[PDB]
Amino acid sequence: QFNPYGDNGGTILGIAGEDFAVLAGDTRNITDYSINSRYEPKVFDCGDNIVMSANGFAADGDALVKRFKNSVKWYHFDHNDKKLSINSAARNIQHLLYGKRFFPYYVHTIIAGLDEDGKGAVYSFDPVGSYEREQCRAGGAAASLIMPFLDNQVNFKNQYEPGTNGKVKKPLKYLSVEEVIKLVRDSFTSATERHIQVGDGLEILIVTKDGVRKEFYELKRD
Amino acid sequence: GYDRALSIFSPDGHIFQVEYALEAVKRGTCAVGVKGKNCVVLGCERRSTLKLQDTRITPSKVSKIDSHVVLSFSGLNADSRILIEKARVEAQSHRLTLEDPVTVEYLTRYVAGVQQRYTQ
Amino acid sequence: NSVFSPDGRNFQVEYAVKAVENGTTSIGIKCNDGVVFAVEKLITSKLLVPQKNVKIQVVDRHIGCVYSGLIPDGRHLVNRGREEAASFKKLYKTPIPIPAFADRLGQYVQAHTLYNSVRPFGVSTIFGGVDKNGAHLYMLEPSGSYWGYKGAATGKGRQSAKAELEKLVDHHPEGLSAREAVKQAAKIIYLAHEDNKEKDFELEISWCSLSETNGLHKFVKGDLLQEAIDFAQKEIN
Amino acid sequence: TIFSPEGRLYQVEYALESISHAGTAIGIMASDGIVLAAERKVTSTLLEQDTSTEKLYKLNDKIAVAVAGLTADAEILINTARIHAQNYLKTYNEDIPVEILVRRLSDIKQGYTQHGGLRPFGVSFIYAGYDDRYGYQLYTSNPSGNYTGWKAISVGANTSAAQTLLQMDYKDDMKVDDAIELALKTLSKTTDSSALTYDRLEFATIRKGANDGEVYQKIFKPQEIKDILVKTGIT
Amino acid sequence: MDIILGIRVQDSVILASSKAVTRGISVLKDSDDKTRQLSPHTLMSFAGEAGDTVQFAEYIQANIQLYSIREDYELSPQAVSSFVRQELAKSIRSRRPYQVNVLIGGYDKKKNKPELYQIDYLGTKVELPYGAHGYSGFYTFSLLDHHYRPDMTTEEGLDLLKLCVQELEKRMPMDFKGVIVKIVDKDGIRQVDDFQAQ
Amino acid sequence: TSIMAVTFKDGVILGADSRTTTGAYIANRVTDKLTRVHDKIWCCRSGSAADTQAIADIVQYHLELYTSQYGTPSTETAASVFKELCYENKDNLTAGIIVAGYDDKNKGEVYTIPLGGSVHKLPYAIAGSGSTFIYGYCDKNFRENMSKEETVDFIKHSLSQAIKWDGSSGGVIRMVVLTAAGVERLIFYPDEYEQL
Amino acid sequence: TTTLAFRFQGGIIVAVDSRATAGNWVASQTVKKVIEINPFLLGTMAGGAADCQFWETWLGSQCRLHELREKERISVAAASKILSNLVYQYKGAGLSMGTMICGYTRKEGPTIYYVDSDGTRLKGDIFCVGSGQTFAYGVLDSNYKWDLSVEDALYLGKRSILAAAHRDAYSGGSVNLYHVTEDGWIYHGNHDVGELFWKVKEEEGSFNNVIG
Amino acid sequence: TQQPIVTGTSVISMKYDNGVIIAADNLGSYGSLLRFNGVERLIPVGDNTVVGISGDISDMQHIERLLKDLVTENAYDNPLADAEEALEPSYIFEYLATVMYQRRSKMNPLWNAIIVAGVQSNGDQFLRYVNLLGVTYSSPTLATGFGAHMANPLLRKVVDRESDIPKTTVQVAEEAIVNAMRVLYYRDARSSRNFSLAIIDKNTGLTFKKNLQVENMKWDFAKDIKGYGTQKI
Amino acid sequence: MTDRYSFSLTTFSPSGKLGQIDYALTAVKQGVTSLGIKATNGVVIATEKKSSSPLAMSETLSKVSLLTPDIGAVYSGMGPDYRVLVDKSRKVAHTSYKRIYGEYPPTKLLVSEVAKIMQEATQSGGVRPFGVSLLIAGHDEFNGFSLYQVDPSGSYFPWKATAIGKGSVAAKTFLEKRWNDELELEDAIHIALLTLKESVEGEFNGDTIELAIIGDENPDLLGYTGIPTDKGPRFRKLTSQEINDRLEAL
Numbered sequence A: 001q002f003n004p005y006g007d008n009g010g011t012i013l014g015i016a017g018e019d020f021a022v023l024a025g026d027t028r029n030i031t032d033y034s035i036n037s038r039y040e041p042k043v044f045d046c047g048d049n050i051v052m053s054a055n056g057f058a059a060d061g062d063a064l065v066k067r068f069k070n071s072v073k074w075y076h077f078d079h080n081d082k083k084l085s086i087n088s089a090a091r092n093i094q095h096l097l098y099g100k101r102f103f104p105y106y107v108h109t110i111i112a113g114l115d116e117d118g119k120g121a122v123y124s125f126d127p128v129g130s131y132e133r134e135q136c137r138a139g140g141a142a143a144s145l146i147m148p149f150l151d152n153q154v155n156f157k158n159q160y161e162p163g164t165n166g167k168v169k170k171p172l173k174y175l176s177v178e179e180v181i182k183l184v185r186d187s188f189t190s191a192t193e194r195h196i197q198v199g200d201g202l203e204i205l206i207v208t209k210d211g212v213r214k215e216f217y218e219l220k221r222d
Numbered sequence B: 001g002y003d004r005a006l007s008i009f010s011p012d013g014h015i016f017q018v019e020y021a022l023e024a025v026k027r028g029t030c031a032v033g034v035k036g037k038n039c040v041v042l043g044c045e046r047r048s049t050l051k052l053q054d055t056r057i058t059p060s061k062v063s064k065i066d067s068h069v070v071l072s073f074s075g076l077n078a079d080s081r082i083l084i085e086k087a088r089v090e091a092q093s094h095r096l097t098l099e100d101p102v103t104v105e106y107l108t109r110y111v112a113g114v115q116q117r118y119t120q
Numbered sequence C: 001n002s003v004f005s006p007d008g009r010n011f012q013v014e015y016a017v018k019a020v021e022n023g024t025t026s027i028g029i030k031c032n033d034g035v036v037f038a039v040e041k042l043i044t045s046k047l048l049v050p051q052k053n054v055k056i057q058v059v060d061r062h063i064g065c066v067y068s069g070l071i072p073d074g075r076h077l078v079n080r081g082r083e084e085a086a087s088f089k090k091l092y093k094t095p096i097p098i099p100a101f102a103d104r105l106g107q108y109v110q111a112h113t114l115y116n117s118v119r120p121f122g123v124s125t126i127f128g129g130v131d132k133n134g135a136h137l138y139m140l141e142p143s144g145s146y147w148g149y150k151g152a153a154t155g156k157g158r159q160s161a162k163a164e165l166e167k168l169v170d171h172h173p174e175g176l177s178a179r180e181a182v183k184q185a186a187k188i189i190y191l192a193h194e195d196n197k198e199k200d201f202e203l204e205i206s207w208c209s210l211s212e213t214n215g216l217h218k219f220v221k222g223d224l225l226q227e228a229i230d231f232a233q234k235e236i237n
Numbered sequence D: 001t002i003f004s005p006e007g008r009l010y011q012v013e014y015a016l017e018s019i020s021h022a023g024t025a026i027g028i029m030a031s032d033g034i035v036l037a038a039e040r041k042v043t044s045t046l047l048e049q050d051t052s053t054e055k056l057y058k059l060n061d062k063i064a065v066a067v068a069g070l071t072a073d074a075e076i077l078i079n080t081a082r083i084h085a086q087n088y089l090k091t092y093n094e095d096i097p098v099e100i101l102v103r104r105l106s107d108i109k110q111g112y113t114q115h116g117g118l119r120p121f122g123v124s125f126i127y128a129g130y131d132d133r134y135g136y137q138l139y140t141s142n143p144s145g146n147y148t149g150w151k152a153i154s155v156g157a158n159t160s161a162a163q164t165l166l167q168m169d170y171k172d173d174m175k176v177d178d179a180i181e182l183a184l185k186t187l188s189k190t191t192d193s194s195a196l197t198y199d200r201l202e203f204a205t206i207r208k209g210a211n212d213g214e215v216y217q218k219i220f221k222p223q224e225i226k227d228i229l230v231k232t233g234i235t
Numbered sequence E: 001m002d003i004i005l006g007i008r009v010q011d012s013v014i015l016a017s018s019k020a021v022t023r024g025i026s027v028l029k030d031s032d033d034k035t036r037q038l039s040p041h042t043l044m045s046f047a048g049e050a051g052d053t054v055q056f057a058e059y060i061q062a063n064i065q066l067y068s069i070r071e072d073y074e075l076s077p078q079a080v081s082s083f084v085r086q087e088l089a090k091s092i093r094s095r096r097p098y099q100v101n102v103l104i105g106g107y108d109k110k111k112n113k114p115e116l117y118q119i120d121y122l123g124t125k126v127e128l129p130y131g132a133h134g135y136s137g138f139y140t141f142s143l144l145d146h147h148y149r150p151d152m153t154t155e156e157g158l159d160l161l162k163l164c165v166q167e168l169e170k171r172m173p174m175d176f177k178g179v180i181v182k183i184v185d186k187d188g189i190r191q192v193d194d195f196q197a198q
Numbered sequence F: 001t002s003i004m005a006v007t008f009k010d011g012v013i014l015g016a017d018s019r020t021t022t023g024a025y026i027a028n029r030v031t032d033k034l035t036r037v038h039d040k041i042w043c044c045r046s047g048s049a050a051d052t053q054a055i056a057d058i059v060q061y062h063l064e065l066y067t068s069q070y071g072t073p074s075t076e077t078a079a080s081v082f083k084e085l086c087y088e089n090k091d092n093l094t095a096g097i098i099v100a101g102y103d104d105k106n107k108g109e110v111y112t113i114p115l116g117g118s119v120h121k122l123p124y125a126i127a128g129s130g131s132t133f134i135y136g137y138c139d140k141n142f143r144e145n146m147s148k149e150e151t152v153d154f155i156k157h158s159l160s161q162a163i164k165w166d167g168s169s170g171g172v173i174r175m176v177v178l179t180a181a182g183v184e185r186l187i188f189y190p191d192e193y194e195q196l
Numbered sequence G: 001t002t003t004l005a006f007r008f009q010g011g012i013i014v015a016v017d018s019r020a021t022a023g024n025w026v027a028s029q030t031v032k033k034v035i036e037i038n039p040f041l042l043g044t045m046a047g048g049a050a051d052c053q054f055w056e057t058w059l060g061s062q063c064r065l066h067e068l069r070e071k072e073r074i075s076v077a078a079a080s081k082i083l084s085n086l087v088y089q090y091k092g093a094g095l096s097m098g099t100m101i102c103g104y105t106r107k108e109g110p111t112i113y114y115v116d117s118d119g120t121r122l123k124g125d126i127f128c129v130g131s132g133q134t135f136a137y138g139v140l141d142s143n144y145k146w147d148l149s150v151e152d153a154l155y156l157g158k159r160s161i162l163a164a165a166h167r168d169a170y171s172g173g174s175v176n177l178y179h180v181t182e183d184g185w186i187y188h189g190n191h192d193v194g195e196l197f198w199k200v201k202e203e204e205g206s207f208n209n210v211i212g
Numbered sequence H: 001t002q003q004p005i006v007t008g009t010s011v012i013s014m015k016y017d018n019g020v021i022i023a024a025d026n027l028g029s030y031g032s033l034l035r036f037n038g039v040e041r042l043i044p045v046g047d048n049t050v051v052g053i054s055g056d057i058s059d060m061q062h063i064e065r066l067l068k069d070l071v072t073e074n075a076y077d078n079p080l081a082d083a084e085e086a087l088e089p090s091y092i093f094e095y096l097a098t099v100m101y102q103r104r105s106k107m108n109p110l111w112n113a114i115i116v117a118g119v120q121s122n123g124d125q126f127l128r129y130v131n132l133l134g135v136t137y138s139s140p141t142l143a144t145g146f147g148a149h150m151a152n153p154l155l156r157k158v159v160d161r162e163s164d165i166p167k168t169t170v171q172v173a174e175e176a177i178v179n180a181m182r183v184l185y186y187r188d189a190r191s192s193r194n195f196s197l198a199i200i201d202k203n204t205g206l207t208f209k210k211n212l213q214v215e216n217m218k219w220d221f222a223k224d225i226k227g228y229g230t231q232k233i
Numbered sequence I: 001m002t003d004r005y006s007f008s009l010t011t012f013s014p015s016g017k018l019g020q021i022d023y024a025l026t027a028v029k030q031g032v033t034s035l036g037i038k039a040t041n042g043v044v045i046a047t048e049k050k051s052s053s054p055l056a057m058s059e060t061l062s063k064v065s066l067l068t069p070d071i072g073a074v075y076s077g078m079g080p081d082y083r084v085l086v087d088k089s090r091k092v093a094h095t096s097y098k099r100i101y102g103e104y105p106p107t108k109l110l111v112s113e114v115a116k117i118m119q120e121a122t123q124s125g126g127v128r129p130f131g132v133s134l135l136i137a138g139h140d141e142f143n144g145f146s147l148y149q150v151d152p153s154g155s156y157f158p159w160k161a162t163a164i165g166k167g168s169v170a171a172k173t174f175l176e177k178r179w180n181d182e183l184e185l186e187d188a189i190h191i192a193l194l195t196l197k198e199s200v201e202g203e204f205n206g207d208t209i210e211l212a213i214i215g216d217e218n219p220d221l222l223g224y225t226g227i228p229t230d231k232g233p234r235f236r237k238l239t240s241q242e243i244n245d246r247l248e249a250l
């Protein structure tokens, strides 16, 4: 029978800082054991200082990103050019996804930007529109290799002050953008080493109160 | 189907069909309502074209909508049935979904709603 | 419209014709291996971008359409024409014969004289092309009526244009060439402007010829247009 | 279906006007039954009276109607009323109460009065029926969708003359036989013919069928009208 | 499995309905009332599929109540049950049928008789001196075949049920948390609200 | 089923066996699989008899309506109509049609529509369960511009091999000759063709 | 998931865990399973995150619309029945949600309704819903009393969630606590199981199943 | 819900310094029966785009038709049809990608894999893939079917990453393509000796080569190979 | 495109008339006279075949039509209206009755069905009433022989004998004088032939007269033998020849 779904690999990573957020993903696109492209970007500037990635089934990802970009466009038309806040985007995205509750977009969606206080914000969604704001989130093929690392290195979980015997948790700091990119690039080199669907290149998008900046690093091509 | 506009504005800003409806009301028998301290009373009359009637079986002018609210009317009897039926259905539907009988004001707003809709 | 008047005629169609008679003059000329279409474009103002308000329309790749009267009505008709051409091609593979295309517009136009809820079309449309067996020229009136023509004209200067065409036909029993009919169309458009000359005009010509365009509809641009505008200017001084 | 400056329904008034020219039908209600009597509009010698019906129709087994107005308009409404009774019986395994069927027919009529742009039905009905909630019942419905109950009532031609005479001779404790007699009397005087012959009449009764504790519908045969016309001194 | 019992004595009808509501591994409620009043003299009890059960009952109730107010009159138990049957019979052949079994117990003021109707989700209706839906019938039917008499008092009818419940509390695998008992007679519907610790 | 159509100098010939089976039972041993959709446009049917008969009837209808409005349709036009029906309804159809026709401009032409609904113009074409067994033979023996008596031979030989090996093929061999001349029907009996 | 809500002398306790899973994968430990519909109405969530999240956010809209239409907050009875009716329209299509609608009104007092995607709607004093429900019930039932002090009841709810968080693989994260009175819901904090388990263990002297 | 019936195998493509090359063989298979031998699976659209299609042939013939009347439609009321408002490779792709994805979303797909090769009016190389699921990607080299598995490895040896593209000439690229077509003929049971190949260059336009053949094949070593293990003669 | 007159074209006027129905009756008045006569063992319907030019073939025009094997119709008024009413009537005899009960409808019920179709044109939006009056002559096992008249209003009534159209007044009188309840079929044919002689201006022969009977069953008009429980149709059109033979003895 015809199967309407595929899996194009592919891993995405969102980290929120004090006055910035990053959304990064690999640039490799795959089918089964083949590489379709080594540079097919999947993290997009959607306007209004929002970056978005829908990882999983690439056809569904694209359809969703297209529709959110159109959603942003019509929001401007219908609401006197108002800036679409990140929380408002998040909600609008839940509705996009949930509209297809009975024929879902096969994607894990992460969006990043700044909340209305200028703080860095990351929201993530499941295929059917359940969402949460978070400090950080991994998505796609290697999410399971990365998330635990992030719990350990972004939220200092299971880390205690030496000598307090085990009675005082390591204090929860904010990370700088230089510090966050180091985690991203390490998370991704680790994932390239151990997951066959992650490799080729890494494209990081950084969002601050002066727009959206882009960076690209190579990944192991095997 | 047929949807030729009947209720329309005149140059002076009156909707003549709505206006002539009021004329039909002023044509019908009288009804009076007065509320007391712990009660409300309704009162009507009957006309005289003939008087060989059977009044066991002829519709009274006060209608029960739900067990706690009544509706009386002046005007075309035939029209009033259609409002009474609709009002009665709504009262049951309100109990079914709100788990509470209608407030008198809610039932009124509904019946007035139906009347309004038939003006446009 | 769904109303016959007591003389057997249709008074709504009759009035549509008035709207047509009131329009810009446009013509068609059949030639030995194609057709040539031309039209008068009134220059309302100096502010019209020249060449940039195109009146002649293509159907499929091989049919030309030009019309006089209510321009929007004409555009509506061509849109229908194009669906009619795609529907035929889709089912039958071959591109649509011109006679067949004539009846498709014929029937559609005629339909709008059947019901009181619609008005007839405020255009007479001249159209034609090269198909599997020859060139064809047609004119279709607001009533739906159409016929094949050697030459056709409609609009404000239709009488003077029809007279000119009659001259050509009678003095060229051996048929006219595509190259010639282009120049003659230019002449005839200049000679229908006489009956409309309070405003300035722009000439527009298209053609469809087996030898000159491979049986495809094409616009007469550049040199060949200028050569025609010259020929027409010459035979008025 | 539109209002006049005065607040009357143009087509309805004209429909009633139409009915005022139709052959007269009468309903009379007794303690032990109901009488239905109707006069046929100016007829001929060759008009078949045997296999004929036009003014009295059976709705179910407990309900009949008398017709004043357009026969064909009436057959439309008779047939859907017959169906409404059958839907009711199928749903509840009980016969339709007389009032309920009457309200439904009157609601259909009312429809053509408020929406659709179609002409109202040119029909008035006299309903004779029995049910175990109210017993014998006589109703009237006209093109306006209005319905009222009656001890005795007339519809169609000459209802004014008819109503005076019934109001004069009707009394609450009447038996069906007196009601039959009154029905013929009234028609005798209201007719636009020389005399009242049997072939110009339709006649029906809804009785307690002598012995059974059950309800019977009798549509009088041509011979039976001819008979009932003799013993009442009309020959 | 859900106990829905009905027994018709001489002057009244008695309905007993189990109190447990159980989803999966948990008993969520021990005091559920598996019954809706259709009119002052007509009571319906129901068991079956989780959602449909109450929606159907309430949908029936609203319709009967609507009819009541429209005619200022109470439909007979027989008329109510035929309505309920027809509803189920239409339902069985629709896209997603109501999976609800019911007992209708009423007192017919015109005839002065009590009446018990058993109707399954397919729309199979029958009048019976006693009835049950589900597994409970596999025990109670034969028990009542023995002990039941047509001319019993209401008080005797309540002893017959005490026996029925006892038997079901002994031999049914599941804990149905006792029964609510209701009597429908000439006066109406009342609850014998002291049957479990009686 | 064994069906074939072959273009040659003067026009085109359609050929077919005459056997219809349900299972291993022969429902009809004298079937006429050569189907006229227009004076000089014919086809051969394989797949479901129901489907191919329904399709051939609608095509016949469309071509009749075509003629009344627009003169004779070309053979390509007829193939397009077949294809439209076969492709658009591919899911609920099992139809393998060969279309062949004679035109004045284009002379003989052959179009094959296989299961999906694709169209293919070919010098000759073969289809039906019988055809697998004659791919080698036919490819080795077909020449362009054969004479009428040569084309009849080629069809006769090919179909007899097809009939020899396929259980679902058999009976008589039917041919229809389509040229300027006219339309000619031909039949050949087992005693004739089994000898070859 | 483990969610609970019980009724007592001092109003209503509502407690929930905060774990979201997909298969055996722990998706989040910091998830909000209580929805605040208005200052007087709470909704709890178990089952499919999207289903509960979407339809209960929607519930809030229907409840707000009722306030504007009728000029008066909606009853718990009717808010529960809006959800329960919607969810019934979708029966068979695979929606998966088990929820409780909790609140106070003047007409009803403190009220709890259980609502699930089967269509079940139940008024009741005590409910536990989710994959840890049985673990919560265990602790809750054996310590519940109507006369519990507001302070004791808050602890019991919190402790019952801990019980389920510990034993049920699919429950954990933290406890979110709510108390509902006449004056409206009052949030009583987020309690990480990381810290709360050990505190409770040492202070209460329970969890002797647990190594060191 | 359907199944491919008559099908045609790999389409292969790569870009070089001044344009794109696309190739595809001329076979239409019917299962394992190599049924039709003259099938053109490269579809030129204007003089800047070529559309190579693999998969179900009847669907390919549908897509052909769609592209032709897309050209017709574009000319309508379009005085700049042959200049600024000429159909672009990017427009043709986005149209097809739209269609493909709608058709899958309706559970009735066009059972194809498509590569759109062309040159944009600004001189940019266009190379993009879309298939029956609506999945789209771009890469210096693209191939469908067996081409994905066998051709890509060979073509990527010439253009591994983006920066290799100004270093690759038409000669080197065409040679890599022609060699890949040979390999595919060696190892793809659904492949054919005859193929078409189109170059779209920003300077030269569309060069459309029909009736190419696979030459310089190695078979001689076959003669020394006997048995499947121990057999000596 | 579409219908834009969704209101009734027949409405009540102040006096209570329905104008469009009256005007349809005036149209019927101009119609060529037609009549029906009911015997004890048959019914006869007959009309004039008014030709327009002797180039017209009057036999090709059916004025007397078979509706069912036992029922027939004839009309006065607008021929084209009658023709479409005949086709609807035949179809409805099947859809409403034969396909349900496996037997043809009795006369009153088919008449009722035609009446329904006519009534609906009296009330539906965007239509004029039918401009015909029909005489329908039929036989059924439980009602025997009957004759009905259906008017533009949809009203229908049973007649022992009647005539409609141009010379209706005159002919109704001629029949009143000649009808008794004891007539054999051949007598009614004779009376019908006499009544029809008063109407016609020009020629009066078998090619200007159309005449049908509903009599006994004709087995030879059935088309098959071997099921003894149908003996054929009761409807028969009299041939040109047969009309002339009754004319010489007139």
Ligand SMILES: Cc1ccccc1CNC(=O)[C@H](CCc1ccccc1)NC(=O)[C@@H](NC(=O)c1ccc(OCc2ccccc2)cc1)[C@@H](C)O
Pocket (backbone or CB within 6 Å): A103, A104, A105, A106, A126, A127, A128, A130, G001, G019, G020, G021, G022, G023, G027, G031, G032, G033, G045, G046, G047, G048, G049, G050, G052, G053, G096
């Ligand atoms: C109550 C609630 C409310 C808020 C937060 C948490 C919860 C608790 N609740 C869960 O943690 C559930 C338990 C599993 C459960 C799921 C559903 C029903 C009952 C139990 N998890 C989820 O809903 C997660 N998503 C998923 O599990 C999925 C949702 C959609 C998917 O799409 C698959 C797909 C795509 C295309 C075609 C076909 C299938 C895959 C995973 C989500 C925390 O990311």
